[PDB]
């Protein structure tokens, strides 16, 4: 189908953690980024790799892991240590397989949300549940970067939203088959799961430290689109002749908030303003199956139209509980961007907050009763 798992939602079910032995020189660099970066051997070990054919990768999970491996190497190669000493050219022996692999997975050749979160995890013990304490990340950039906390908490917000996403078939079939009671329970279960996803979101304080995120990790997730340090983008040597620009990572790339915008008929990506264009641009950084899923929902009959047309105050309350849990998520998110970015910035990015406030505002405008 749309590669949406019932238990983990948009996340890659049970990611592969090991590559064929043919790729150990890739794997060795990725597993050792904190040391190799700290000493300054990282760029040297990248520039000495042979060119490895990607054709020994033979399933979606092996290719997803290879993309995560090459994507971490690329960020560590471009940004190095984080203090302005960048590289504007990606060596051929990594750029070519990376770009080839990315074309096959239909992703931009830059680290995205779906690599470093949705494929970058493992259970400690496969027979115990998906709790923080039973999980680990597969790669990190620097000692102290809080990558495990940041990646795993984002992942756990995705798994919470999965119990909501599981209900979306029920919504459209209760509409088609005119089943009012069924549609009302469905919307109320969605709001319930959206409310639990927000409480899982509070665990970002438990595991991520603002100074670590702002001054270490944020750097390795940054991109080269409208970035003054790489004003023309990145040359992917041996693959494209001219430098290319791509945006850095963001859970704007998470389909979960865009999922429920489309479902509830909230008019985010409709218009020509800068908030709509960004949200549609971020859809090019999502896995193709998830891109197609969001478009498939966009073409179905409106859930908002249905509830608005049937003079049914219980239905309207259920829809509003959904819009409200969405508004709560984005407001808490505003808070998070204040604690983890704006405050540490002071120790131009005011278009950041104007974007997020416009999206939250548009969301709360869809409420049926103020
Ligand atoms: C330290 C933690 C986080 C920070 C600092 C942060 C920051 C940001 C920033 C700066 C943007 C603007 C997009 C851009 O300029 O690239 C953004 C957008 C977004 N973020 Fe986060 N984020 C964090 C965690 C999360 C988590 C855990 C989620 C949900 C799983 C999330 C969901 C979203 C979404 C959906 C958008 C797009 C705007 C919208 O749909 O309302 N973020 N975030
Ligand atoms: N250079 S900048 O302004 O600070 N970049 C801001 C873009 N937002 C983010 N930066 O860093 N994580 C971001 C973000 N926002 O929702 N979510 C986020 C969460 C987990 C991930 F693995 C990735 Br990749 C992105």
Swiss-Prot record:
Function statement: Catalyzes the first and rate limiting step of the catabolism of the essential amino acid tryptophan along the kynurenine pathway. Involved in the peripheral immune tolerance, contributing to maintain homeostasis by preventing autoimmunity or immunopathology that would result from uncontrolled and overreacting immune responses. Tryptophan shortage inhibits T lymphocytes division and accumulation of tryptophan catabolites induces T-cell apoptosis and differentiation of regulatory T-cells. Acts as a suppressor of anti-tumor immunity.
Note, other: IDO1 is the target for therapy in a range of clinical settings, including cancer, chronic infections, autoimmune and allergic syndromes, and transplantation.
Known tissue expression: Expressed in mature dendritic cells located in lymphoid organs (including lymph nodes, spleen, tonsils, Peyers's patches, the gut lamina propria, and the thymic medulla), in some epithelial cells of the female genital tract, as well as in endothelial cells of term placenta and in lung parenchyma. Weakly or not expressed in most normal tissues, but mostly inducible in most tissues. Expressed in more than 50% of tumors, either by tumoral, stromal, or endothelial cells (expression in tumor is associated with a worse clinical outcome). Not overexpressed in tumor-draining lymph nodes.
Name of the protein in its database record: Indoleamine 2,3-dioxygenase 1
Pfam family, one: IDO
Gene Ontology terms for molecular function: electron transfer activity; heme binding; indoleamine 2,3-dioxygenase activity; metal ion binding; tryptophan 2,3-dioxygenase activity
Positions that bind heme b: 333
Family affiliation: Belongs to the indoleamine 2,3-dioxygenase family.
EC number: 1.13.11.52
Matching InterPro entries: Indolamine_dOase (IPR000898), Trp/Indoleamine_2_3_dOase-like (IPR037217)
Species classification: Eukaryota, Metazoa, Chordata, Craniata, Vertebrata
Record GO biological process: 'de novo' NAD biosynthetic process from L-tryptophan; female pregnancy; inflammatory response; kynurenic acid biosynthetic process; L-tryptophan catabolic process; L-tryptophan catabolic process to kynurenine; multicellular organismal response to stress; negative regulation of interleukin-10 production
PROSITE patterns for this protein: IDO_1 (PS00876), IDO_2 (PS00877)
